[PDB]
Structures are given as structure tokens and as C-alpha cells.
Design a protein around this ligand. Sequence first.
Ligand SMILES: O=c1ccn([C@@H]2O[C@H](COP(=O)(O)OP(=O)(O)O)[C@@H](O)[C@H]2O)c(=O)[nH]1
Ligand SMILES: NC(=[NH2+])NCCC[C@H](N)C(=O)O
Length: 303
Amino acid sequence: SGHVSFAGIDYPLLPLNHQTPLVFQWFERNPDRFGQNEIPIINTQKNPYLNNIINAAIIEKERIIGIFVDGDFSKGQRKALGKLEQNYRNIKVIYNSDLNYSMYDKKLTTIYLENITKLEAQSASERDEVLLNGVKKSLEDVLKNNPEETLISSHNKDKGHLWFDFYRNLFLLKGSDAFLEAGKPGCHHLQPGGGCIYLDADMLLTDKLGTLYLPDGIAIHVSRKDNHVSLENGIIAVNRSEHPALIKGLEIMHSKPYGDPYNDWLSKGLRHYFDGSHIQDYDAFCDFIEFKHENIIMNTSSL
Ligand SMILES: O=c1ccn([C@@H]2O[C@H](COP(=O)(O)OP(=O)(O)O)[C@@H](O)[C@H]2O)c(=O)[nH]1
Ligand SMILES: NC(=[NH2+])NCCC[C@H](N)C(=O)O
């Protein structure tokens, strides 16, 4: 079609053409279980992840493919990627530390003390003292722990999947202009404030994706088994840098103590923006936001 309507509001279908880079990501806690001249991306039998991107990149030799990486990498491991970039020159390895996220950041001192004030400003007979006293101990712990400690800094490598699911959302905010910001070669063909298509390393290209159309230029993976529909972070495709729906999620992250990239940033951001007042069902959003492609065997890690 040319559009789709949700919550009574109308939403045009927006193009994501074959310029639009595929993004994969690998945040690796333990680089030293790799060879120091091995590509520090996993290719195990159960998770032959280094293999899934290459085949992706081969199936799409004429759209850019980004590999969003992060971890304390040996010089030789960085040149394993280097070989990977010249041996296949649509692949672009991008180090998380080579991007500046200061414009999207916030201090937990700030974030906590905000909520402390909000709660203290409410009636004592209404208010969440149980929460009121948790944010203050969180407060008490960050002061001692470090004063200048932030949202971004918190979702660190020590923190498990939050480490990479948080920075994912940031990446997409920066979109295709991030190929430029790290300085990656042969990316002049990317359009400015242009989108991207993140993919779990396990979503399998089989055939070409071509030119995608989306409601407002955004869609995410939705899983449906056996009957339990959820939103998934394992595909995220936007048509531009700093898409609003994710922007709203970054605000919720700013305005919530203990925000979660999955619960708050991804899920509620999308849906509040698409459905601020919850007039359509959850599922009826899941359907509306679902990313459909027959040429990808979705989320093969479940097998
Ligand atoms: O050590 C890890 C583990 C996972 N991931 C990211 O998590 C995505 C999906 O993980 P997977 O399908 O293995 O786990 P699931 O979420 O499906 O259990 C991967 O493509 C990676 O981008 C990562 O960066 N480092
Ligand atoms: N975004 C995603 N596809 N996440 C993975 C969900 C599937 C998960 N591997 C399972 O045991 O079912």
C-alpha cells in the first residue's frame, strides 16, 4: 500500500532503499578467549556468528554493512577486523569508543535527585515511599561509588545484555551518519541523517532484501510463539537519524529511575509515540510495528 492507520492517526509508508546499511553488533566481554589474531567475533557451531554476517554481506555486495563492535581489543584483533574490511569492502567495522554520545547522556545524580524531588513533592498519603526510599539509597550508593557517573556509563560491559542493547538504541539514533563520524571509507554513498537496519547476527539473509517500506519509517522484530506476541530488539530498522519514537524512549530513560532499554526505551518509546494513550491493544501495535521480510530466517538462535 501507500500508508497505514493506527489509533485513528494516519501514517505514510516511507522508503528504505538499498543504500541503507545493514547493521550487526558484537559487544564482547572476554576478548581473551579469542586468539589475538582471530576476529573477536564468535563463530561457534551453535553460534557461528562471524559466519552469518559475511554471508549477509555477500548476499548484499552493494549495500553497506556495519559491524558495531566494542570490547578491550588487542592490536592484532583489531587487524583481524582490518583484514575483514579489505577482504570484503562493503563491511565497515565501527568501534563504540569512536562515537561520541554526550548529546544523549545524563548523570544518575541528576536523574535520581529529580525523582527524589518529584516523590517528596507529592502527598505523603499518596506516595510511593517504598520507591522514595530506594532512589535515595541508589543516590547514597552512586555518591560513594562515583559522583560523575552517567546513564551511558552505567550500561557497561559489566552489565550484561544491557551493555549492547542500550548502545544499540544509541547507534540507531546516530543512524547512517555514524559511518561518517568514525571516518569509515567508501561511505560517501550514504544519505545524510539517513537510517539503518540493525540485525541480530542470527537473523539470516537468504536472498536480497531490496527496498523496504515502513509505517513512519520504523519497524522492529516481533516474535509470535506459540501465541505470545512480544516486541524484540533483534531487528531495528529506521529511515533517519534520531527517529522520534526512539527519541521519546531516550526521554523515558532520562525521566525514569532504573529505565530499561527493552522495557522503557524500545517498548514504551515506540508505543507511547505511536499510541500515547493506549487506545489500541498491545498486539494491535505489535502487528502495526512488525517488520516483515521473507528473505530473512528470523532469530535462528532459538534453535
Ligand atoms: O555477547 C554478546 C551476546 C549477544 N550480543 C548481541 O545480541 C544479539 C542477539 O543475541 P542472540 O540471538 O545470541 O541471543 P537472544 O537475545 O536471541 O537470546 C547478537 O546479534 C548481538 O548483537 C552481543 O553483542 N554480545
Ligand atoms: N530479538 C530477538 N529475536 N530475541 C531473541 C528471542 C528468542 C530467544 N533466543 C529464545 O530462546 O526464544
